[PDB]
Amino acid sequence: SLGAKPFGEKKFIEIKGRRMAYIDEGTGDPILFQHGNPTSSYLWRNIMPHCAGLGRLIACDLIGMGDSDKLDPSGPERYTYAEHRDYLDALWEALDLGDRVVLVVHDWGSALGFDWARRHRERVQGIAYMEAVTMPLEWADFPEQDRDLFQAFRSQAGEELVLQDNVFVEQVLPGLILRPLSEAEMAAYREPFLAAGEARRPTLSWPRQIPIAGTPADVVAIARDYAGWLSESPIPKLFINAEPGHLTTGRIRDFCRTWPNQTEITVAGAHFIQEDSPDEIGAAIAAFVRRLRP
Ligand SMILES: [Ca+2]
Ligand SMILES: [Cl-]
Ligand SMILES: [Cl-]
C-alpha cells in the first residue's frame, strides 16, 4: 500500500570517521535498495515490504543524505560521485553482504550500483533498475522540460537555487511525482535539508555530476564502463519502465532495452516512480527475486 511510515528501524555504523544510516531487516542473501538524489532509504518504504521473507532487506542512506552524517567541511568540491562511492563501497563492505546480492536501484543509486556491480560481478545475483542513468548522456537525451533548470544547477546560479532555496527537494521532487504527497511524506524528504547552506550540498553536487556531453569526464568514463559491461553481462536483470517516465525514455531506454537476460514491466510514474506505483514495483521485484532464489 501507500503510507508515510518508514520501513523498519534506522541503524548506524561508523564509516571513514562519519556515521552512516541504513535499514537492515531479516536474514539471508541481501536485497539491496539504493536511492539517489534528493531522496533517502525512505523512498523504498512501501516497496521493501513486498520482499519480506525473501532475504535480507537493506536500504542505505548516502553520505550527507537521510540520517547519514554530513561531510565536514562541506563545499563546492564535496559530494562528488567519487566521494559518494568511497563511502558507499566502505558501507557495503562493512555490512558483510556475501556473494549473492540482488541490487535494486534508482537515479544516482543506479550509477553507484551499476558501477559497484561491474567491480564485483561475481557477487551480483541480479539487478533491478528504474529511472536510471543507463549510459553517458547528450543534452538531446535529457528531458526537454528540465534542460534549463539542470543547466542552471550546473552554473553559478546553482548555489542560490539549491543551497538557499532547496529547489531540488521542494520543486524537482514533487514535480516528478504524479500523485500529491502528504505533509508527512514531504516532511520526511525535507528533514535532512531543513537548514539552508551546506546541509543541502549533496542535492546540488549531484546534478553537477550527471555525465552530460562529456562532462564531468570522470563520471562519463564510469558510465561508459558500466554501459558497455551491462550490455554484455548475462546477470539477470529487471527493468522497471515507467509511463510517461522521465529519464529512462528515448535513446537511454532504447539502449538499456538491449541488455541481455532482462525482464521488463511498465508502471505508472514520472521520475520518482516509487511514490506512484510502489505495489506494482514491489510485486515485480518480489517475483524477480523468487525466480532468482527458487
Ligand atoms: Ca507532482
Ligand atoms: Cl551463500
Ligand atoms: Cl541529480
Side-chain angles (χ1 to χ4, degrees), residues 2-80:
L2 297 153
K5 233 89 140 82
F7 184 78
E9 158 215 23
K10 214 57 84 71
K11 291 168 184 183
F12 297 87
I13 192 164
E14 183 126 291
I15 299 296
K16 297 163 61 66
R18 313 281 191 190
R19 228 168 321 277
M20 298 188 73
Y22 66 101
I23 302 159
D24 180 5
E25 302 286 338
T27 60
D29 290 316
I31 308 172
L32 186 55
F33 299 78
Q34 194 55 66
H35 83 263
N37 197 36
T39 62
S40 72
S41 56
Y42 188 82
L43 184 70
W44 303 107
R45 76 199 174 279
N46 294 319
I47 296 171
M48 296 173 76
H50 283 89
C51 292
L54 300 182
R56 183 179 165 206
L57 314 181
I58 302 172
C60 300
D61 293 343
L62 298 178
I63 200 71
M65 312 184 78
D67 292 314
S68 291
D69 277 358
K70 304 292 177 179
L71 297 176
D72 178 10
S74 178
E77 285 171 40
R78 305 305 296 276
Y79 298 109
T80 55

Side-chain angles (χ1 to χ4, degrees), residues 36-38 107-108 142 150 153 168 172 202-210 271:
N37 197 36
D107 190 273
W108 277 111
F142 198 82
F150 281 70
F153 292 151
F168 221 111
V172 181
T203 70
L204 174 59
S205 289
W206 272 137
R208 290 184 169 164
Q209 289 283 284
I210 310 167
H271 186 61

Side-chain angles (χ1 to χ4, degrees), residues 149-210:
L149 183 63
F150 281 70
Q151 285 165 11
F153 292 151
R154 298 159 71 92
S155 79
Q156 290 302 289
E159 274 82 6
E160 180 178 8
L161 288 161
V162 180
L163 307 190
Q164 300 178 29
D165 291 340
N166 214 11
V167 158
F168 221 111
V169 175
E170 305 284 9
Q171 174 185 342
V172 181
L173 178 60
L176 298 174
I177 294 166
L178 304 178
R179 71 147 180 113
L181 296 177
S182 72
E183 162 184 4
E185 290 168 323
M186 274 309 292
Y189 282 126
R190 86 167 52 85
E191 201 174 73
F193 305 120
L194 288 161
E198 292 300 329
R200 295 160 181 178
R201 180 66 72 177
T203 70
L204 174 59
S205 289
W206 272 137
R208 290 184 169 164
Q209 289 283 284
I210 310 167

Side-chain angles (χ1 to χ4, degrees), residues 242-265:
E243 176 64 43
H246 188 259
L247 175 60
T248 311
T249 58
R251 194 172 76 113
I252 106 167
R253 175 166 62 193
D254 291 339
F255 178 63
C256 72
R257 277 179 174 158
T258 69
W259 299 353
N261 204 10
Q262 180 167 276
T263 297
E264 181 184 324
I265 69 146

Side-chain angles (χ1 to χ4, degrees), residues 14 19 33 38 52 55 77 80 104 112 147 201 203 207 210 219-221 226 228 233 279 281:
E14 183 126 291
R19 228 168 321 277
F33 299 78
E77 285 171 40
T80 55
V104 181
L112 287 161
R147 277 172 209 166
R201 180 66 72 177
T203 70
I210 310 167
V219 186
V220 169
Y226 71 60
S233 177
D279 295 316
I281 292 161

